[PDB]
Amino acid sequence: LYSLRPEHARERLQDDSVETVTSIEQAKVEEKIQEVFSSYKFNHLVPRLVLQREKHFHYLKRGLRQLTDAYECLDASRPWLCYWILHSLELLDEPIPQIVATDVCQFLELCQSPDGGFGGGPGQYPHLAPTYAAVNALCIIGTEEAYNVINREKLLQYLYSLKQPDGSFLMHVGGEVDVRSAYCAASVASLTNIITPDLFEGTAEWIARCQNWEGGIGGVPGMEAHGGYTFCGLAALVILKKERSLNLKSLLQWVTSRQMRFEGGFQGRCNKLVDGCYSFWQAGLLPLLHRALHAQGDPALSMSHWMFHQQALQEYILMCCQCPAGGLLDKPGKSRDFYHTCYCLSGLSIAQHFGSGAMLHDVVMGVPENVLQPTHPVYNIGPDKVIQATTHFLQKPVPGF
Amino acid sequence: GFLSLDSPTYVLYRDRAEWADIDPVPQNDGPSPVVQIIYSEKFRDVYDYFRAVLQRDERSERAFKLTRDAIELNAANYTVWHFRRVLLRSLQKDLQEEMNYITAIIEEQPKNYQVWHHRRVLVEWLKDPSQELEFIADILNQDAKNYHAWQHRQWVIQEFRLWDNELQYVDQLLKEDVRNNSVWNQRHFVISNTTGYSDRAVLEREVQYTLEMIKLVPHNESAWNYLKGILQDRGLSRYPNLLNQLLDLQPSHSSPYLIAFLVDIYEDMLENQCDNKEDILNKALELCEILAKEKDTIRKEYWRYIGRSLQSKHS
Ligand SMILES: C/C(=C\COP(=O)(O)OP(=O)(O)O)CC/C=C(\C)COCc1cccc(C(=O)c2ccccc2)c1
Ligand SMILES: [Zn+2]
């Protein structure tokens, strides 16, 4: 274990004897993480990195049917809960009973708006986030019933209703704009084959304006570079085949600088705290950058590894992010939730599976039963589901109106 | 008459007479619900009634007051926020009282998107930005890195052209925490939208300031990234003295940020036809190995790539 090596203690924060809220909070985290790393030594047991599959599974299969009122704050994000859970099960190789699947299809049907797109629950106005989630869920299920749920003409019409003159998209009508809306749109339109010629006109340019002095991408032009927005911006560009619109080098330098030398996991933005969900938004960028630089025929690219420390990340997630009762989380001391379970699991899979053409190199830390199903770095659903969905919807032509 | 959702004497809407006429529309989750939330009686109650007034599109003062309860139960429900803005215009509500409302709920839930978007819509309607910089500063006094707060600040400053005092504010927060990257970002936002970095005097002022900050906190990554960010533009090799000046902190302020910044300067020298190319290249590769094997092993895959790529390029 890279984290447990003695030389690793040298990675602890050096505050230069100038304390600020930033150094003080980072220190608290490193202290907390250190107690976790060293627990084995203090209890004299041999470290056993084991992904608690059965624990995670009961938590997931349970949340997929019902949730306590703690989830009232997610009453407007129900298609998200379906996506996070169904996607987590998928990574855990847990299949969806034809009965559950149809129930989910029926539910998302209630969330779907008569004017295209999906709402966060039965009867809610459509919004791009739950639309992205609903569509991703339906593709994970991948049945003809699931695919048929999506009204492709109203969906395209809906995207057009959010399209802006500058290339951006509103998240919903009378709503806000940021890099997430472009990704939600590019994701659902590509998967469902509704991309017309002018739909994403000027979108690659608008997203490129979101890249700042840091190399990363902010929510809108001018904003601080963030891991969540940077994944959306780059993944959207890959879908649009415009990755080259970004300074890929400065971005590569920024994302790799986000891995915490000590904790091993990724932080969202410079000088903030590590968080397990970033195992996906940040680490997920490396596979994307790999593909892009290789598309530019980059000779120096690795033939076996992603450009981040895959070992340290897997160690952070396994030792520091699992809840004994099942479910994964932000960092030690945090409460488990379906969002973090989805992204900690998603980021683990990215850390375990490498691929670049004919090259396929796995790196599974701990018990080999730790290997999870691979995840497509752009859509974040199984690679097979993506091929299966696009191949299906390609049988339908792009809505002419 | 706002009966607080928290009030000890708060009563369900169904147990309320001024509501009695309207029948509550429950939620249709289907015969076989999934990710079904076991609502509390209160949550369930307010939403069945919200559903009812919305289904009938009842633009009443009573509907306006209920949305407030539905928002407090779930501030992320954008549909409710939507209807609420609908009612703000119909009933012709005092938008200043509504600014007071949104100021209060943002203080309570500053990390919510809806609350901030709503405030923006109000500022647009009233075309009044007078309270903004002060309100936002109070939120940043609680969480100096709130992304929404910084986004809102950027929008108010750009829309209403309130640039004059932001660089001073930035200096203030940098004194408070020189590691606050949101502030280093704000610094670049202000400068690039006012003077720009082509003005050599400004550039000089900024590169010197940043260098002092590095002296004080050599391991503060933000100062380093800002230094790279404003010079990287014109090409780090365009600045001869800089390589020297950093090679001096080599024993004093020599974190792996200094090491990395040197590989950055070398990278650019190689690309811009530098003298001693064979020499400079070995250095950059030496640093790349010191980094990959010793100083910055978390980024070994990156530093190796940098090594390879550098060779492939200037062999
Ligand atoms: C404010 C902020 C980060 C700042 O958070 P902070 O707590 O300060 O954390 P850090 O310190 O780690 O930055 C933005 C984080 C962005 C992320 C995680 C991008 O995630 C992808 C995505 C796609 C589509 C929708 C969403 C939504 O989250 C969503 C939610 C509601 C409505 C619609 C869509 C996200
Ligand atoms: Zn998180």
Domain count, chain A: 1
Q: At A264, which CATH number?
A: 1.50.10.20
Q: Give the ligand whose atoms come closest to the C-alpha of residue A341.
A: 2
Residues with CB under 5 A from ligand 2 (ion): A 275, 277, 330
Q: Give the ligand whose atoms come closest to the C-alpha of residue A130.
A: 1
The H-assigned helical ranges of chain B are: 41-55, 61-73, 78-90, 95-108, 113-126, 132-140, 147-159, 166-176, 181-192, 200-216, 221-231, 240-248, 256-271, 277-290, 300-314
Cα(B59)–Cα(B51) distance, rounded to whole angstroms?
A: 13
List the single residue in A18, A71, A219 with the smallest CB-CB distance to B151: A219
Tokens of A298: 């980059």
Q: Are A125 and B79 in contact (CB under 8 A)?
A: yes
Q: At B228, which CATH number?
A: 1.25.40.120
Nearest Cα residue to A34 out of A319, A360, A335, A361 = A319
Ligand 1 binding pocket, CB closer than 6 Å = A 129, 132, 171, 180, 184, 226, 228-229, 232, 268-269, 272, 275, 281; B 111, 113, 147
A115 interaction partners in chain B (CB closer than 8 Å):
none
SS3 for B181-198 is HHHHHHHHHHHHCCCCCC
Domain that holds residue A21: 1-401
CB contact under 8 A, B35 and A298: no
* DSSP secondary structure of A35-97: HHHTHHHHHT--------HHHHHHHHHHHTTEE-GGGGGGTT-HHHHHHHHHHHHHHTTPPPP
Q: Are A324 and A51 in contact (CB under 8 A)?
A: no
CB contact under 8 A, B182 and A224: yes
Nearest Cα residue to A297 out of B309, B245, B50, B31 = B309
Cα(A73)–Cα(B157) distance, rounded to whole angstroms?
A: 32
Of B81, B147, B154, the one to substitute when testing ligand 1's pocket (max ligand atoms within 8 A of C-beta) is B147
Cα(B223)–Cα(A305) distance, rounded to whole angstroms?
A: 31
Q: Are A377 and A187 in contact (CB under 8 A)?
A: no
The DSSP call for residue A216 is S
Q: Are A180 and A233 in contact (CB under 8 A)?
A: no
Indicate which atom in ligand 1 lies nearest the CA of residue A132: 24
Handedness of CA A158, A160, A165, A167 (dihedral sign): positive
Domain count, chain B: 1
A140 interaction partners in chain B (CB closer than 8 Å):
none
Tokens of A335: 């409460």
Calculated CA dihedral for residues A255, A261, A263, A267, nearest 10 degrees: -20
Experimental method: X-ray
Q: In this complex, is the C-beta atom of A18 within 8 Å of any C-beta atom belonging to chain B?
A: yes
Helix B181-192 / helix B166-176 crossing angle, nearest 10 deg: 160
Domain that holds residue B18: 1-315
Residue in A278, A316, A339, A343 annotated catalytic? A278
Backbone φ, ψ for residue B264 (5° rounding): -70, -45
Instruction: Provide the chain A residues 44-63 that lie in CB contact (below 8 A) with chain B.
Output: 63
